[PDB]
Design a protein around this ligand. Structure first.
Ligand SMILES: Cc1cc(-c2c(-c3ccccc3)c3cc(Cl)ccc3[nH]c2=O)on1
Length: 303
C-alpha cells in the first residue's frame, strides 16, 4: 500500500485560471512554520495505515494570537522517505491553493524540530456522512446548504486547476454553525479495511469514481463533478451507501458504463435530483461545472 496524495494540480489553459507552476515540484514556503512547542496534543481524531491526525490546541496561531483547537496531520515512525515526501507534496499543494471557507484549510506546519506536522483546521461536528446517519431534526434546507457549500469549495479547487479525485460525504467535515468543508481525510481513515476502496493491485473509491476514471485512469475536474453527484445522493439518501445492495464487480462496471444511474433518493427534490443526473452524464463535456451547479443551487432562491 502506497500513501499517494489524492489532490493534484493539473495544467489547464482555456480555463479561467492558468497554471504557471506546479507547487509540488519545488516550493517550501517557510511562512507556515509554527513552534511545535506551542501545540498541545489532544486525543487522536483518527488514524490509518500511514499515520494519524490528532486534536490539539495552538497557542498564538496567525497574526491575531488566537488559541484555537486544531487538527494535526502527522505520520507514524514506521514512515520512510517516500511517505515523508508525499506528506510535503500535500502541504505545498495546500500552501498554493490558498484559503477558502468551504475547504479544510492549512494553518501551519512544523518542518523543523523533528517530525513534520501539518496543522489544519478543526471542525467540531465531524464528517457529513456520520452526521446524516445520526440525524435521520434535519430540514430539507439543511441538506440543500451542504450541497451548495460543498459545491462552492469544489468550485474553488476547480478555480486553481486542482482535482480532488475522492469526493464523498466521508471527506466533508462540518465546522461551526454546521458549515461544510471538503478535504481529504486519507490519513485519518484506515483504507486497508474500508470496503468502499477496492483494490487495484491501490485503493480507489470506485462507486464514486467517474466511468472515465475507472476504465481509462483519467482524472479531470469533470471526473470530480460526477463523484460530486454521488455525494448529493448520499446527502439526500441521508447517508445510504451508493448503489445499495449492488456489489462492486464485473457486473457493476458494465452497469455504470451502460448509463445506469441510482434511483432518486427519498428526500431529493426533483430539480436537485436533476443535478445528479447531469453530474452523472456519460460524457465529461456534458456534465456541468461546479460553478454552474453552484449558481443553480442558488437559483433555488425560491425560499
Ligand atoms: C470526529 C471528528 C473528526 C474531525 C476532523 C478530522 C477527521 C478525523 C478522522 C476522520 C475524519 C476526519 C480531520 C482530518 C484531517 Cl486529515 C484534517 C483535519 C481534520 N479536522 C477535524 O476536525 O473532527 N471531529
Amino acid at each position: 500500500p502506497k500513501y499517494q496524495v489524492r489532490w493534484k494540480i493539473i495544467e489547464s489553459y482555456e480555463g479561467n485560471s492558468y497554471t504557471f507552476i506546479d507547487p509540488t515540484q519545488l516550493p517550501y514556503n517557510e511562512k507556515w512554520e509554527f513552534p511545535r512547542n506551542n501545540l498541545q496534543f489532544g486525543k487522536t481524531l483518527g488514524a490509518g495505515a500511514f499515520g494519524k491526525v490528532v486534536e490539539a490546541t495552538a497557542f498564538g496561531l496567525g497574526k491575531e494570537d488566537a488559541v484555537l483547537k486544531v487538527a494535526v496531520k502527522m505520520l507514524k515512525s514506521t514512515a520512510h522517505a517516500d511517505e515523508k515526501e508525499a506528506l510535503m507534496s500535500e502541504l505545498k499543494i495546500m500552501s498554493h491553493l490558498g484559503q477558502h471557507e468551504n475547504i479544510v484549510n492549512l494553518l501551519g506546519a512544523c518542518t523543523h524540530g523533528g517530525p513534520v506536522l501539518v496543522i489544519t483546521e478543526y471542525c467540531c461536528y465531524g464528517d457529513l456522512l456520520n452526521f446524516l446517519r445520526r440525524k435521520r431534526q434535519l430540514s430539507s434546507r439543511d441538506l440543500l446548504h451542504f450541497s451548495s457549500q460543498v459545491a462552492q469549495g469544489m468550485a474553488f479547487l476547480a478555480s486553481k486547476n486542482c482535482i480532488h479525485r475522492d469526493v464523498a460525504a466521508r471527506n466533508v467535515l462540518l465546522t461551526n454553525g454546521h458549515v461544510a468543508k471538503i478535504g481529504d481525510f486519507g490519513l485519518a481513515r484506515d483504507i486497508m479495511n474500508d470496503s468502499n476502496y477496492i483494490v487495484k493491485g491501490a485503493r480507489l473509491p470506485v462507486k464514486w469514481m467517474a466511468p472515465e476514471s475507472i476504465f481509462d485512469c483519467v482524472y479531470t475536474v469533470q471526473s470530480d463533478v460526477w463523484s460530486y453527484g454521488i455525494l448529493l445522493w448520499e446527502i439526500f439518501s441521508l447517508g445510504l451507501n451508493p448503489y445499495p445492495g449492488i456489489l462492486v464487480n464485473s457486473k457493476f462496471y458494465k452497469l455504470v458504463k451502460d448509463g445506469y444511474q441510482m434511483a432518486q433518493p427519498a428526500f431529493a427534490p426533483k430539480n436537485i435530483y436533476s443535478i445528479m443526473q447531469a453530474c452523472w452524464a456519460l460524457e465529461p463535456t456534458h456534465r456541468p461545472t461546479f460553478q454552474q451547479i453552484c449558481s443553480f443551487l442558488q437559483e433555488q432562491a425560491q425560499e
